[PDB]
Amino acid sequence: APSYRVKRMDIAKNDEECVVNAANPRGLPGDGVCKAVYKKWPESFKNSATPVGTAKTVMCGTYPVIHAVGPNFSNYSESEGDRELAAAYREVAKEVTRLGVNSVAIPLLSTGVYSGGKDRLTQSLNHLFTAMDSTDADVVIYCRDKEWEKKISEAIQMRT
Numbered sequence: 103a104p105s106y107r108v109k110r111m112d113i114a115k116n117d118e119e120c121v122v123n124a125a126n127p128r129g130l131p132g133d134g135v136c137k138a139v140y141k142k143w144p145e146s147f148k149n150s151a152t153p154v155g156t157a158k159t160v161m162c163g164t165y166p167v168i169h170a171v172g173p174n175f176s177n178y179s180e181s182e183g184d185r186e187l188a189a190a191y192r193e194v195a196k197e198v199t200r201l202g203v204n205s206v207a208i209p210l211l212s213t214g215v216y217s218g219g220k221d222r223l224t225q226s227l228n229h230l231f232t233a234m235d236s237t238d239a240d241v242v243i244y245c246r247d248k249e250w251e252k253k254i255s256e257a258i259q260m261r262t
């Protein structure tokens with residue numbers, strides 16, 4: 103049975119068959135999540151650049167890194183940001199399905215430096231669910247904050 107789980111830990115140390123990078127459209131290392139990811143899979147950043155609201159897979163050996171570019175809400179309107187955030191997760195689902203993986207490590211896109219200083223846990227997570235509910239891979243969501251871990255854990259529990 104495909105499940106959702108949540109783990110408070112560095113996504114760069116995931117035990118899934120592929121990772122989603124919370125990427126910038128330029129395909130740059132940046133800092134935060136994208137740093138950890140650049141350090142663990144640096145050859146995955148060869149031609150990783152992809153537009154806002156899209157996902158691009160680059161192999162590190164045989165290990166797929168999915169660069170998903172959620173919107174920077176500093177730059178977008180709430181309604182355009184929402185559209186772009188939904189579509190990035192949609193692209194993740196397509197890439198996970200194309201890759202035929204049994205599991206995927208995924209961060210909550212647009213909830214850090216790209217949040218525009220707003221709490222978007224529920225917005226980002228719901229878009230993740232909408233997208234990934236149609237796939238048959240185990241989904242492990244990575245966060246750093248305990249409060250976020252619990253709230254994510256509850257949102258998972260209350261769908262079953």
Ligand SMILES: COC(=O)c1ccnc(=O)[nH]1
Binds near residue numbers: 170212
């Ligand atoms: C994951 O938290 C973020 O703010 C983020 C940064 C870069 N790209 C994203 O898609 N999201």
